[PDB]
Amino acid sequence: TRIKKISIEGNIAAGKSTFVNILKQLSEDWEVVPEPVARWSNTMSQKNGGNVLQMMYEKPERWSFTFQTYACLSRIRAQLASLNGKLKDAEKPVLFFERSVYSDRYIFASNLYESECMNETEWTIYQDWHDWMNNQFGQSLELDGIIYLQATPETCLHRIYLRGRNEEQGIPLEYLEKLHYKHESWLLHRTLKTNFDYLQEVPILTLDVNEDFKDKYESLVEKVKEFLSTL
Amino acid sequence: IKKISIEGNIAAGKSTFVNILKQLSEDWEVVPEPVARWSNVQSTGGNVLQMMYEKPERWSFTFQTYACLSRIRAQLASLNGKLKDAEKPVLFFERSVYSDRYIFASNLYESECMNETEWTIYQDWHDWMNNQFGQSLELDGIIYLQATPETCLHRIYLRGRNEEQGIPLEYLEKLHYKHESWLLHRTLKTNFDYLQEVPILTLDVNEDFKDKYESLVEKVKEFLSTL
Ligand SMILES: Cc1ccc(NC(=O)c2ccc(CN3CCN(C)CC3)cc2)cc1Nc1nc(-c2cccnc2)cs1
Ligand SMILES: O=c1ccn([C@@H]2O[C@H](COP(=O)(O)OP(=O)(O)O)[C@@H](O)[C@H]2O)c(=O)[nH]1
Ligand SMILES: O=c1ccn([C@@H]2O[C@H](COP(=O)(O)OP(=O)(O)O)[C@@H](O)[C@H]2O)c(=O)[nH]1
Ligand SMILES: Nc1ccn([C@H]2C[C@H](O)[C@@H](COP(=O)(O)O)O2)c(=O)n1
């Protein structure tokens, strides 16, 4: 489509929602599509969404498959509906997504299967499912570049505390670390091999969101806007 | 590309009758229930059908979802078959997506195996699946293979499928009633509005037709002439 698609990636509490908001406000033809999993951190889809997430917190090993499949469905469904937004009849349309279909499977669900929360028959079903739902759409959802909000696992643990979600207070530094490394291996080093080929040659901008960018954000916004010309 | 559904209870006589019809003529093909794709989970062991009967309080959601998505997959694949290339093409589906929700998943939710969250997620999913990908799988006529839950319980034993040799009558009963309330009594209301005016051909399959299937083909040939 005419509408370009950019993915906003990063660790838990790295600064994705703060950045996507700073971008929503800007007077450009940009539409932001939030993470359904973030919308459950607080409708006929939230009712479910909140309950799986609350169940995901309580018993991880039981809900990891139920949750990861409803995350990717509520993401796929959303992102497709965003493409039909006003932007179509807009000049320079850019659609930014809080995370992506690739971040779900490769970074989080994978880590969840590795964490012995999804069994082997559970993982096979998720992988065969994901593979199929992505293949059954096309260039519709294909990313035209990714933005990696790089932050040390320690800034994420202090921002987890900042955010104040009491369910997330328990999250340990090791978990963030384990996530951080899975990000760097895909986005930075690019040693992580996804099923979807096209990702191999996709531009990636890496914004060091370590020091609070909440109010000092003109610097990123420019390095973003230039990144946008190169696509 | 006339799409017919073959509906009925566990071991009522769906494949038997389906495979009698398939042999009968060209331009007639069958889209079986992938109850072996569930039996050996791979990427198109792991017997998601056994784990389900083992502990449904833990596997019913995981199952009905994979059962439904594997169907949508093979049913859609069959429409892109060689049937399109012949006169009078009538494709026969062993059960449907309406069967996977209004009978089996619905019963499991009613039997406490799926908590409300699981059930709501299943409906949310099955609704969006059928709206998007299954916009072409809309049935042209349903054949109901009506058999007592007692007969099914005897055929289940004849079959000797171990995954299900531990099925109580209660279960077969609960399903027999749901198929009656949907296909005979016509009172199981669905999210898919057209279903309301889809012809049904209810055939009693209690008295064995393995070699006495003459009458049933004579009725179905007539049924497919109204369609
Ligand atoms: C919300 C949530 C809350 C708690 C947990 N649980 C854990 O991180 C976790 C807790 C305990 C363990 C330890 N297990 C204990 C039991 N044992 C069987 C195995 C090991 C392993 C993992 C997972 C999550 N799941 C998450 N999903 C996401 C996510 C975001 C975006 C898209 N998809 C998923 C982020 S965090
Ligand atoms: O530069 C930053 C980025 C984020 N935050 C805060 O840190 C928390 C986590 O950030 P965010 O909501 O963006 O989480 P994410 O979407 O990355 O998971 C929130 O309370 C933000 O307001 C902040 O104070 N400064
Ligand atoms: O007229 C019939 C139809 C079936 N069967 C037996 O019933 C079992 C289950 O048959 P089928 O798989 O066709 O039923 P479905 O479960 O597909 O409804 C098998 O062991 C068949 O030999 C039978 O004895 N007589
Ligand atoms: N949506 C569905 C469809 C089928 N089955 C299971 C019940 C039986 O164990 C088996 C019946 O297979 P068939 O009638 O094709 O032999 O499939 C199920 O639990 N849920």
XYZ file of C-alpha atoms and ligand atoms in Angstrom:
564
model
C 0.000 0.000 0.000
C 0.719 3.815 -0.318
C 0.843 3.765 3.545
C 4.308 2.803 4.903
C 4.492 0.572 8.048
C 7.112 1.161 10.842
C 7.540 -1.128 13.916
C 8.357 0.490 17.368
C 10.410 -2.285 19.197
C 12.012 -2.523 22.633
C 12.231 -4.153 26.072
C 9.488 -3.993 28.809
C 9.149 -0.344 29.995
C 11.968 0.785 27.571
C 9.865 3.793 26.444
C 7.568 2.545 23.559
C 4.222 4.050 24.787
C 5.878 7.410 25.756
C 7.486 7.619 22.267
C 4.349 6.547 20.314
C 2.440 9.290 22.203
C 5.122 11.912 21.449
C 4.676 10.900 17.830
C 0.782 10.834 17.906
C 0.799 14.616 18.885
C 3.068 15.624 16.018
C 1.445 17.451 13.133
C 2.409 14.841 10.441
C 0.360 12.220 8.537
C 1.324 9.566 11.161
C -1.049 7.068 12.742
C 0.043 5.000 15.741
C -1.415 1.533 16.458
C -0.818 0.471 20.145
C -0.081 -2.991 21.492
C -3.286 -4.941 22.400
C -1.259 -6.487 25.323
C -0.542 -2.841 26.524
C -4.302 -2.017 26.224
C -4.922 -4.976 28.610
C -2.651 -3.305 31.202
C -5.257 -1.019 32.984
C -15.053 -3.358 25.113
C -15.797 -6.914 23.997
C -12.132 -7.646 23.384
C -10.672 -6.134 26.519
C -13.000 -8.101 28.697
C -11.189 -11.270 27.458
C -7.838 -9.537 27.047
C -7.597 -8.324 30.638
C -8.652 -11.767 32.060
C -6.061 -13.754 30.079
C -3.395 -11.261 31.087
C -4.550 -11.557 34.806
C -4.551 -15.364 34.325
C -1.138 -15.083 32.547
C 0.230 -13.300 35.739
C -1.267 -15.869 38.193
C -0.460 -19.236 36.318
C 2.073 -18.654 33.457
C 2.538 -22.387 32.440
C -1.267 -22.789 31.789
C -2.089 -19.517 30.028
C 1.041 -18.878 27.966
C -0.449 -20.526 24.879
C -3.978 -19.157 25.316
C -2.463 -15.631 25.829
C 0.118 -15.624 23.059
C -2.511 -16.750 20.491
C -5.021 -14.089 21.598
C -2.175 -11.446 21.540
C -1.268 -12.138 17.915
C -4.910 -12.377 16.847
C -5.809 -9.059 18.588
C -2.656 -7.582 16.983
C -3.297 -8.932 13.377
C -7.009 -7.778 13.564
C -5.969 -4.281 14.803
C -3.083 -3.506 12.383
C -5.287 -4.465 9.315
C -8.093 -2.093 10.515
C -5.518 0.718 10.953
C -4.564 0.476 7.253
C -8.225 1.479 6.463
C -7.906 4.647 8.602
C -7.958 8.198 7.285
C -4.426 7.864 6.098
C -5.282 6.241 2.830
C -6.538 9.653 1.421
C -3.425 11.290 3.065
C -0.182 12.678 1.516
C 2.773 10.947 3.213
C 1.103 8.121 5.262
C 3.213 6.382 7.967
C 1.624 3.859 10.314
C 3.716 3.153 13.452
C 2.925 -0.098 15.462
C 3.721 -0.629 19.237
C 5.729 -3.878 18.580
C 5.017 -6.369 15.787
C 3.910 -9.963 14.813
C 7.721 -10.809 14.699
C 8.341 -9.516 18.244
C 5.502 -11.787 19.542
C 6.749 -15.137 18.096
C 10.533 -14.633 18.098
C 11.070 -12.549 21.197
C 8.293 -13.137 23.698
C 6.507 -16.360 22.930
C 9.784 -17.979 22.137
C 11.236 -16.832 25.517
C 7.996 -18.189 27.058
C 8.485 -21.613 25.420
C 12.171 -21.539 26.498
C 10.900 -20.623 30.097
C 8.958 -24.001 30.081
C 5.554 -22.153 30.061
C 4.441 -23.505 26.640
C 4.890 -27.312 26.119
C 6.201 -28.915 22.851
C 2.683 -29.640 21.430
C 1.709 -26.071 22.614
C 4.716 -24.494 20.799
C 4.208 -26.560 17.623
C 0.478 -25.465 17.519
C 1.487 -21.698 18.099
C 4.247 -21.795 15.489
C 2.134 -23.611 12.821
C -0.712 -21.159 13.605
C 1.333 -17.908 13.501
C 3.115 -19.073 10.263
C -0.312 -19.574 8.650
C -2.028 -16.371 9.772
C 0.954 -14.282 8.531
C 1.073 -16.190 5.192
C -2.766 -15.682 4.861
C -2.554 -11.819 4.553
C 0.402 -10.795 2.353
C 2.293 -7.488 1.824
C -0.738 -5.967 3.700
C 1.138 -6.187 7.057
C 4.790 -6.193 5.651
C 7.102 -3.705 7.587
C 8.878 -0.925 5.616
C 11.426 -0.408 8.447
C 11.786 -0.904 12.222
C 12.694 1.534 15.091
C 14.651 -0.172 17.974
C 14.266 1.744 21.318
C 17.480 0.383 22.871
C 17.758 0.659 26.676
C 19.906 -1.204 29.257
C 17.823 -3.924 31.110
C 18.477 -1.785 34.287
C 16.674 1.381 32.884
C 13.708 -0.937 32.096
C 13.630 -2.231 35.738
C 13.626 1.349 37.088
C 10.899 2.341 34.484
C 8.927 -0.771 35.495
C 9.022 0.597 39.048
C 8.171 4.092 37.657
C 5.072 2.757 35.729
C 3.934 1.328 39.093
C 1.975 -1.730 37.791
C 2.226 -3.891 40.980
C 1.942 -7.142 38.929
C 5.122 -6.060 37.091
C 7.039 -5.120 40.250
C 7.962 -8.751 40.745
C 9.646 -8.945 37.328
C 13.302 -9.620 37.950
C 16.302 -8.139 36.225
C 17.288 -11.496 34.740
C 14.052 -11.664 32.795
C 14.723 -8.255 31.231
C 18.291 -9.224 30.462
C 17.022 -12.469 28.721
C 14.664 -10.223 26.686
C 17.263 -7.482 25.953
C 19.688 -10.066 24.469
C 16.902 -11.542 22.246
C 16.320 -7.993 20.893
C 19.985 -7.200 20.186
C 20.322 -10.590 18.385
C 17.534 -9.741 16.038
C 17.673 -5.983 15.647
C 21.335 -5.107 16.164
C 23.601 -7.998 15.459
C 20.870 -9.484 13.315
C 22.048 -13.086 14.112
C 18.402 -14.208 14.867
C 16.820 -16.125 11.906
C 13.034 -15.549 11.492
C 10.801 -17.655 9.138
C 9.763 -14.482 7.236
C 12.693 -13.823 4.800
C 11.977 -10.154 3.909
C 12.990 -9.038 7.466
C 16.705 -9.815 6.639
C 16.947 -6.668 4.437
C 14.672 -4.144 6.344
C 16.127 -0.799 7.646
C 16.580 -0.436 11.427
C 17.058 2.862 13.322
C 18.502 2.438 16.874
C 17.544 5.217 19.308
C 19.353 5.128 22.680
C 16.376 5.940 24.892
C 18.474 5.483 28.096
C 18.390 9.013 29.499
C 14.817 10.292 29.898
C 13.709 11.469 26.469
C 10.138 12.224 27.821
C 10.657 16.032 27.507
C 14.034 16.147 25.575
C 12.731 14.376 22.403
C 13.324 16.750 19.429
C 16.712 14.901 18.879
C 15.052 11.452 18.328
C 12.129 12.871 16.276
C 14.721 14.276 13.782
C 16.806 10.967 13.588
C 13.327 9.347 12.960
C 12.229 11.800 10.266
C 15.508 11.355 8.406
C 15.241 7.571 8.751
C 11.813 7.983 7.068
C 13.300 9.616 3.900
C 15.536 6.527 3.330
C 12.480 4.243 2.846
C -18.929 -26.191 -6.391
C -21.846 -27.251 -4.213
C -20.646 -27.605 -0.563
C -22.498 -30.302 1.501
C -21.952 -30.908 5.271
C -22.082 -34.468 6.707
C -23.066 -34.031 10.411
C -23.670 -36.504 13.233
C -22.547 -37.968 16.603
C -19.172 -39.657 17.376
C -19.167 -43.043 15.423
C -22.700 -42.446 13.911
C -21.490 -43.440 10.384
C -20.048 -40.216 8.791
C -16.949 -41.536 7.027
C -18.486 -44.907 6.157
C -21.360 -43.225 4.232
C -19.049 -40.460 3.028
C -16.689 -43.008 1.495
C -19.614 -44.911 -0.110
C -20.627 -41.707 -1.927
C -17.098 -40.789 -2.955
C -16.689 -44.075 -4.786
C -20.020 -43.735 -6.507
C -19.165 -41.027 -8.967
C -16.767 -38.538 -10.384
C -17.426 -34.821 -9.579
C -18.069 -35.961 -5.986
C -15.165 -35.573 -3.565
C -14.910 -35.746 0.263
C -13.088 -33.332 2.657
C -12.539 -35.563 5.757
C -12.302 -34.450 9.369
C -8.560 -34.288 10.028
C -8.788 -36.591 13.109
C -5.201 -37.747 12.504
C -3.726 -34.219 12.169
C -5.015 -33.785 15.719
C -3.698 -37.352 16.530
C -0.027 -36.425 15.421
C 0.597 -32.660 15.852
C 3.379 -31.498 13.475
C 3.902 -28.264 11.386
C 1.866 -28.094 8.086
C 3.883 -37.405 18.873
C 1.685 -34.595 20.238
C -1.743 -36.280 20.308
C -3.788 -33.087 21.041
C -6.948 -35.343 20.806
C -5.626 -37.697 23.582
C -4.337 -34.831 25.865
C -7.837 -33.316 25.487
C -9.695 -36.538 26.590
C -6.914 -36.988 29.256
C -7.625 -33.601 31.000
C -10.158 -31.307 29.193
C -10.067 -28.631 31.990
C -6.535 -27.987 30.622
C -6.723 -28.828 26.908
C -10.269 -28.153 25.499
C -9.421 -24.507 24.380
C -6.029 -25.579 22.899
C -7.878 -28.409 21.093
C -11.113 -26.853 19.604
C -8.943 -23.958 18.232
C -6.433 -26.311 16.484
C -9.340 -28.583 15.387
C -11.167 -25.598 13.804
C -8.079 -23.918 12.192
C -6.924 -27.316 10.690
C -10.460 -27.725 9.186
C -10.714 -24.122 7.695
C -7.238 -24.924 6.205
C -8.123 -28.309 4.528
C -11.663 -27.279 3.639
C -10.439 -24.114 1.822
C -7.683 -26.205 0.158
C -10.307 -28.630 -1.227
C -12.205 -25.730 -2.969
C -8.978 -25.159 -5.014
C -9.103 -28.881 -5.966
C -9.749 -30.557 -9.318
C -13.532 -30.682 -8.647
C -13.987 -27.169 -10.221
C -12.913 -28.747 -13.620
C -15.928 -31.211 -13.827
C -19.750 -30.974 -14.374
C -22.006 -31.320 -11.233
C -19.104 -30.798 -8.671
C -20.430 -31.679 -5.163
C -17.831 -31.505 -2.364
C -18.798 -33.291 0.915
C -17.372 -31.882 4.204
C -17.039 -34.342 7.135
C -18.577 -32.025 9.816
C -18.255 -28.184 9.641
C -17.011 -25.035 11.460
C -20.629 -24.603 12.770
C -20.279 -28.136 14.277
C -16.911 -27.221 15.951
C -18.527 -24.333 17.787
C -22.210 -24.911 18.302
C -21.808 -28.586 19.327
C -18.284 -29.560 20.598
C -16.755 -26.295 21.943
C -20.194 -25.146 23.228
C -20.668 -28.479 25.035
C -17.116 -28.248 26.573
C -17.844 -24.713 27.826
C -21.170 -25.966 29.266
C -19.269 -28.919 30.887
C -16.893 -26.526 32.808
C -13.825 -27.658 30.593
C -13.511 -24.117 29.180
C -13.774 -21.226 31.647
C -15.726 -18.153 30.333
C -12.490 -16.336 29.272
C -11.464 -19.390 27.138
C -15.014 -19.576 25.630
C -15.192 -15.846 24.849
C -11.732 -16.008 23.263
C -12.873 -19.065 21.166
C -16.009 -17.234 19.973
C -14.011 -14.001 19.319
C -11.547 -16.079 17.236
C -14.064 -18.376 15.423
C -16.197 -15.288 14.564
C -13.215 -13.372 13.045
C -11.914 -16.559 11.334
C -15.218 -17.186 9.560
C -15.712 -13.501 8.723
C -12.215 -13.133 7.143
C -10.890 -16.590 5.791
C -14.123 -18.671 5.748
C -16.194 -16.185 3.657
C -16.435 -18.980 0.936
C -17.043 -22.094 3.120
C -20.826 -21.267 3.317
C -22.859 -24.528 3.142
C -25.356 -25.363 0.371
C -27.007 -28.288 2.272
C -26.452 -30.451 5.439
C -26.946 -34.293 5.680
C -27.727 -35.340 9.284
C -26.702 -38.948 10.163
C -29.186 -39.422 13.073
C -28.311 -42.273 15.378
C -29.113 -42.872 19.061
C -26.254 -42.062 21.561
C -26.505 -45.829 22.439
C -25.727 -46.930 18.825
C -22.745 -44.489 18.723
C -21.449 -45.961 22.008
C -21.607 -49.414 20.358
C -19.942 -48.181 17.131
C -17.201 -46.377 19.189
C -16.356 -49.862 20.649
C -16.526 -51.525 17.146
C -14.050 -48.815 15.971
C -11.696 -49.504 18.892
C -10.138 -46.009 18.704
C -8.363 -45.932 22.112
C -8.280 -42.033 22.296
C -12.117 -42.344 22.925
C -12.846 -45.906 24.333
C -13.380 -43.999 27.614
C -16.363 -41.953 26.493
C -19.407 -42.101 28.818
C -23.005 -42.171 27.543
C -23.636 -38.747 29.281
C -21.237 -37.164 26.743
C -22.684 -38.875 23.591
C -26.174 -38.008 24.954
C -25.312 -34.253 25.468
C -24.002 -34.181 21.824
C -27.008 -36.129 20.375
C -29.363 -33.568 21.887
C -27.323 -30.557 20.498
C -27.430 -32.062 16.930
C -31.241 -32.541 17.348
C -31.778 -28.937 18.624
C -29.768 -27.681 15.630
C -30.584 -29.917 12.652
C -34.014 -31.466 13.580
C -35.881 -29.182 16.020
C -34.175 -26.122 14.523
C -33.745 -23.992 17.658
C -29.987 -23.598 18.171
C -29.551 -19.897 17.269
C -26.221 -19.021 15.503
C -24.095 -15.825 14.755
C -24.245 -16.970 11.067
C -27.733 -15.754 10.054
C -28.056 -17.591 6.760
C -27.803 -20.987 8.416
C -31.558 -20.537 9.208
C -32.607 -21.562 5.637
C -30.025 -24.298 4.758
C -31.700 -27.602 3.787
C -31.172 -30.648 5.982
C -31.487 -34.312 4.928
C -31.982 -36.290 8.210
C -31.129 -40.002 7.615
C -31.576 -42.689 10.285
C -28.316 -44.665 10.252
C -29.171 -46.942 13.241
C -29.830 -50.076 11.193
C -26.351 -50.900 9.676
C -25.806 -49.721 6.077
C -22.240 -51.133 5.427
C -23.901 -53.406 2.737
C -27.575 -52.109 3.092
C -26.863 -48.506 1.878
C -29.264 -48.663 -1.146
C -32.086 -46.516 0.409
C -29.819 -43.692 1.686
C -28.197 -43.005 -1.739
C -31.708 -42.891 -3.337
C -32.708 -40.130 -0.797
C -29.449 -38.080 -1.150
C -29.597 -38.182 -4.993
C -33.095 -36.604 -4.629
C -31.826 -34.085 -1.982
C -28.970 -32.930 -4.315
C -31.615 -32.354 -7.095
C -33.299 -29.576 -4.965
C -29.795 -27.983 -4.810
C 2.286 -10.680 31.642
C 3.053 -11.752 32.074
C 3.139 -11.919 33.458
C 3.860 -12.961 34.039
C 4.557 -13.836 33.210
N 5.235 -14.858 33.746
C 6.587 -14.911 33.659
O 7.308 -14.066 33.124
C 7.143 -16.044 34.239
C 6.934 -16.287 35.603
C 7.476 -17.430 36.183
C 8.226 -18.318 35.402
C 8.754 -19.462 36.002
N 7.982 -20.677 35.673
C 7.337 -21.238 36.879
C 6.590 -22.530 36.534
N 7.389 -23.486 35.725
C 6.462 -24.446 35.119
C 8.149 -22.898 34.606
C 8.899 -21.652 35.047
C 8.455 -18.062 34.040
C 7.900 -16.924 33.450
C 4.471 -13.689 31.818
C 3.804 -12.611 31.237
N 3.702 -12.587 29.887
C 4.148 -11.598 29.095
N 3.783 -11.492 27.806
C 4.266 -10.393 27.159
C 3.978 -10.135 25.859
C 4.066 -8.841 25.320
C 3.749 -8.600 23.978
C 3.324 -9.631 23.138
N 3.227 -10.932 23.651
C 3.548 -11.161 25.008
C 5.039 -9.590 27.929
S 5.136 -10.277 29.483
O 12.117 8.504 28.750
C 11.230 7.957 29.404
C 10.434 6.850 28.967
C 9.461 6.371 29.761
N 9.200 6.910 31.011
C 8.197 6.296 31.907
O 8.597 4.962 32.150
C 7.447 4.091 32.197
C 7.606 2.977 31.194
O 7.591 3.518 29.860
P 6.494 3.126 28.797
O 5.140 3.505 29.258
O 6.824 3.857 27.502
O 6.557 1.549 28.561
P 6.679 0.596 27.289
O 5.626 0.898 26.288
O 8.096 0.791 26.741
O 6.571 -0.850 27.801
C 6.215 4.983 32.044
O 5.597 5.231 33.303
C 6.773 6.229 31.344
O 6.001 7.396 31.618
C 9.931 7.977 31.496
O 9.735 8.480 32.591
N 10.914 8.438 30.655
O -23.404 -48.488 9.113
C -22.396 -48.449 9.832
C -21.489 -47.344 9.938
C -20.407 -47.439 10.733
N -20.136 -48.579 11.478
C -18.936 -48.643 12.338
O -18.918 -47.484 13.138
C -17.559 -47.106 13.426
C -17.402 -45.625 13.214
O -17.787 -45.311 11.863
P -17.463 -43.916 11.171
O -15.982 -43.574 11.382
O -17.782 -43.915 9.723
O -18.275 -42.788 11.956
P -18.001 -41.243 12.248
O -17.317 -41.129 13.597
O -17.126 -40.646 11.169
O -19.388 -40.599 12.401
C -16.656 -48.003 12.581
O -15.943 -48.934 13.390
C -17.615 -48.649 11.573
O -17.213 -49.974 11.237
C -20.986 -49.671 11.451
O -20.841 -50.653 12.168
N -22.068 -49.545 10.609
N -14.936 -30.032 16.838
C -14.714 -31.306 17.152
C -14.809 -32.318 16.152
C -14.517 -33.579 16.515
N -14.142 -33.887 17.811
C -13.676 -35.255 18.158
C -14.685 -36.085 18.934
C -14.284 -37.506 18.559
O -13.260 -38.028 19.411
C -13.804 -37.355 17.111
C -14.819 -37.754 16.064
O -14.181 -38.007 14.792
P -15.011 -38.661 13.544
O -16.482 -38.519 13.810
O -14.528 -37.962 12.235
O -14.564 -40.128 13.452
O -13.437 -35.965 16.947
C -14.104 -32.880 18.798
O -13.885 -33.184 19.976
N -14.382 -31.597 18.423
